[PDB]
């Protein structure tokens, strides 16, 4: 009713707002070079007029998926991004050069110059995210007969990022929130994915990624350590509880539509990800006045972590959208499978929504199933309603919304907020991303080793783009 139509409208707004934030024709970011995704046009309090590898990677992957689904007009935006990355990779910065750690640098100026002040650096998710976004585009180029562009432009760029991940995964750094110096689930999860799809891509182009192959299994091995028995620990080397939407993000950004409810990869429907889901969301129920009065079977406004004090610690549009997207993903998986399972690990999650929940296997034709799935859908939609309630009248999505009154705060028109909107809508409509090979990369080795593999680095120069038609 309100929701479906609001989403339809918001999706259009979200696409437009992202384009306005990408150089060099982006309406909100004059000064940004060609293909530079700006986090936000906000240049003062806060100053987000920079380009983050993470934000850009996430945004572009989203645009790539839209493109592959028929949004052909996004072609030049993607080409520009790729071209810009060829340059950025080579920018000498506080984290190093191309071959000596440069790839890990969190953000840059919109003009493609290094940001030299103090920052929580490096952030090792970046390279993984940029690689995943490029690989998707690379796959389309292969499928549509533009092998050369894939082999000579995309591969070489990806190869740099894959080498970095394989080389430093087992080293500390900052989390996606840029505040904890340690080992972060989100980072580890996206790094394992990148290596697996990086390897398949390498083969597709007639090359190889030996370092992708030796390291992926080891990253996976390590990933298991994040399960505490009741939830996913966001970070090692932290004094916090460990409950963080970092873990929801890790799950949705590594969702493979071909995968079952695999615990080893923390898929959306896995018992571990469902138990984690409740523990995370529940942590925001009594700390935000905006959540006052809601029951345990009701959607709530979700922040980053319960201990957050950034701008006082408020819910985030993207964190709230992620809580819904994980559910949309699990619905798709159960439906595709033709059953859902309730285990001791995930009982609390189900029991909060369907009080008659009991462990066992429920086929898609069973009454229990119908009852659970409707309840899950209503819950998932509830998170999206909170978003709709607090968005600006014209559809503007901010970074945060006030924990007490829901007013928008922090960076305005946050590009990441817009991409999160698109992906949650997509999943809601059963529009899923291409598979990354999870079905051949969920086996955990019997012994985890603290290791690395060094790949190879080489500077890429993009002379010209072939005249691609879509
Ligand atoms: C839905 O409607 C919304 C409501 O109208 C609409 O949002 C509005 O969009 C306009 C842009 O179209 C915004 O205008 C900008 O305002 C800047 C000042 O903002 C502060 O003051 C406002 C007035 O009191 C506040 O309302 C505003 O609050 C918002 O932002 C807060 C912080 O993020 C947030 O917490 C609040 O909740 C609220 O959301 C804020 O406090 C003003 O500075 C800016 O001017 C620049 O941009 C113009 C062009 O876009 C230029 O002509 C102008 O000269 C300035 O250019 C400089 O900055 C640009 C980047 O933004 C650069 O591209 C330029 O190159 C240039 O940069 C120079 O300076 C930099 C210094 O740091 C430097 O880094 C550069 O290198 C360079 O040297 C513009 O006027 C307005 O703020 C929005 N209002 C609200 C309430 O959000 C929204 O877009 C609509 N949505 C949709 C989907 O349509
Ligand atoms: C490089 O790779 C190696 C190999 O994979 C990594 O080594 C593994 O590291 C993990 C994490 O330290 C380690 O797991 C610990 O094992 C201990 C016993 O075997 C546990 O006592 C410890 O418990 C913590 O995590 C649990 C979840 O697994 C929680 O239930 C528990 O509450 C503990 O969590 C608290 O304490 C930790 C302290 O570690 C703190 O940081 C948290 O924030 C939280 O407060 C772990 O389970 C494996 O045993 C190691 N494996 C091997 C073979 O040595 C190495 O960590 C990698 N390094 C980097 C930088 O990436
Ligand atoms: C944008 C970012 O802002 C906050 O963190 C910043 C500090 O504001 C900044 O001053 C700097 O802090 C270092 C400090 O200057 C130095 O004196 C001290 O030694 O070390 C500090 C490093 O810990 O850098 C940090 C970032 O490292 C918030 O705490 C961050 O959560 C916030 N990140 C946002 C913004 C973006 C852009 O969209 C997202 O990529 C990110 O996920 C999100 O959390
Ligand atoms: C993930 O992949 C492993 C192999 O790596 C399978 O054994 C598992 O069933 C799942 O498909
Ligand atoms: C499943 O496959 C992994 C490699 O992907 C092995 O390390 C594991 O022991 C199991 O055979
Ligand atoms: C880390 O450890 C593995 C095996 O223990 C090695 O093969 C690798 O070269 C690195 O030293
Ligand atoms: C990654 O780090 C390992 C340490 O285990 C080295 O052996 C390897 O050569 C690469 O530097
Ligand atoms: C890791 O080490 C290799 C050598 O095995 C280098 O080629 C690479 O650039 C990185 O330093
Ligand atoms: C590592 O490998 C690449 C690809 O073979 C080389 O181009 C690079 O110079 C380094 O030797
Ligand atoms: C390493 O590889 C890149 C990508 O092909 C080249 O541009 C560079 O000349 C070196 O051979
Ligand atoms: C690869 O790196 C070189 C510098 O090492 C740059 O000149 C080139 O633009 C590309 O980024
Ligand atoms: C791409 O190729 C040029 C040579 O045409 C280099 O100068 C650049 O650093 C990158 O390797
Ligand atoms: C266009 O031209 C430059 C100069 O030969 C190359 O380095 C680049 O890889 C592309 O082929």
For residue 158, what is the domain's CATH number? 1.50.10.10
Method: X-ray
Q: Which atom of ligand 10 is nearest to the CA of 456?
A: 1
Query: Measured from the CB, is residue 459 less than 6 Å from ligand 9?
Result: no
Cα dist from 360 to 332, 340, 451, whole Å:
19, 9, 40
Token pair for residue 54?
A: 């993470």
Ligand-binding annotation for 177, yes or no, is: no
For residue 179, indicate whether it is catalytic. Answer: no
**Domain total of the chain:** 1
Could you list the residue range(s) of the whole structural domain that residue 171 is in? 1-470
How far apart are the C-alpha atoms of 284 and 348, rounded to whole Å?
17
Phi and psi angles of residue 365, each rounded to the nearest 5 degrees, phi first: -100, -10
Token pair for residue 23?
A: 């150089």
456 alpha carbon, closest ligand: 9
Query: Measured from the CB, is residue 459 less than 6 Å from ligand 12?
Result: yes
How far apart are the C-alpha atoms of 211 and 169, rounded to whole Å?
12
Is the CB of residue 404 less than 8 Å from the CB of residue 290?
yes
> If you measure from the C-alpha of residue 179 to the centroid of ligand 3, how many angstroms do you get, rounded to a whole number?
6
| Bridge partners (DSSP) listed for residue 447 | none
Cα dist from 190 to 92, 134, 252, 360, whole Å:
25, 14, 10, 31
Protein residue with its CA nearest to atom 7 in ligand 11: 90
How far apart are the C-alpha atoms of 74 and 72, rounded to whole Å?
5
């Amino acid at each position: 009713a309100t929701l479906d139509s609001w989403l339809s409208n918001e999706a259009t707004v979200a696409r437009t707002a992202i384009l306005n934030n990408i150089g060099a024709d982006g309406a909100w970011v004059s000064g940004a070079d060609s293909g530079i995704v700006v986090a936000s046009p906000s240049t003062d309090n806060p100053d987000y007029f920079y380009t983050w590898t993470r934000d850009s990677g996430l945004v572009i992957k989203t645009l790539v998926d839209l493109f592959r689904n028929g949004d052909t007009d996004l072609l030049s935006t993607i080409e520009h991004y790729i071209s810009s990355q060829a340059i950025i990779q080579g920018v000498s910065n506080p984290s190093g050069d191309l071959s000596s750690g440069g790839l890990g640098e969190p953000k840059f100026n919109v003009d493609e110059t290094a940001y030299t002040g103090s920052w929580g650096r490096p952030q090792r998710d970046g390279p993984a995210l940029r690689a995943t976004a490029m690989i998707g585009f690379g796959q389309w180029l292969l499928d549509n007969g533009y092998t050369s562009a894939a082999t000579e432009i995309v591969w070489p760029l990806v190869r740099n990022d894959l080498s970095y991940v394989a080389q430093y995964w087992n080293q500390t750094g900052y989390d996606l929130w840029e505040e904890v110096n340690g080992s972060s689930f989100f980072t580890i999860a996206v790094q394992h994915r990148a290596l697996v799809e990086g390897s398949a891509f390498a083969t597709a182009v007639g090359s190889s990624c030996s370092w992708c192959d030796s390291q992926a299994p080891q990253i996976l091995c390590y990933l298991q350590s994040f399960w505490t028995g009741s939830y996913i620990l966001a970070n090692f080397d932290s004094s916090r509880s460990g409950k963080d939407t970092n873990t929801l993000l890790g799950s949705i950004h590594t969702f493979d539509p071909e995968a079952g409810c695999d615990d080893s990869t923390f898929q959306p429907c896995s018992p571990r990800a469902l138990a984690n889901h409740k523990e995370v969301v529940d942590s925001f129920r009594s700390i935000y006045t905006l959540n006052d009065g809601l029951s345990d079977s009701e959607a709530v406004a979700v922040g980053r972590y319960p201990e957050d004090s950034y701008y006082n610690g408020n819910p985030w549009f993207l964190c709230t959208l992620a809580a819904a997207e994980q559910l949309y993903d699990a619905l798709y998986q159960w439906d595709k499978q033709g059953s859902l399972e309730i285990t001791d690990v995930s009982l609390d999650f189900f029991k909060a929504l369907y009080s008659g929940a009991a462990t066992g296997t429920y086929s898609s034709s069973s009454s229990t199933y119908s009852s659970i799935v409707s309840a899950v859908k209503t819950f998932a939609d509830g998170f999206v309603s909170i978003v709709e309630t607090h968005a600006a009248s014209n559809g503007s999505l901010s970074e945060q919304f006030d924990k007490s009154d829901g007013d928008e705060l922090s960076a305005r028109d946050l590009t990441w907020s817009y991409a999160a909107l698109l992906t949650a809508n997509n999943r809601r409509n059963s529009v899923v991303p291409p598979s990354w090979g999870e079905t051949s990369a969920s086996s955990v080795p019997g012994t985890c080793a603290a290791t690395s593999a060094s790949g190879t680095y080489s500077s890429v120069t993009v002379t010209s783009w072939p005249s691609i038609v879509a």
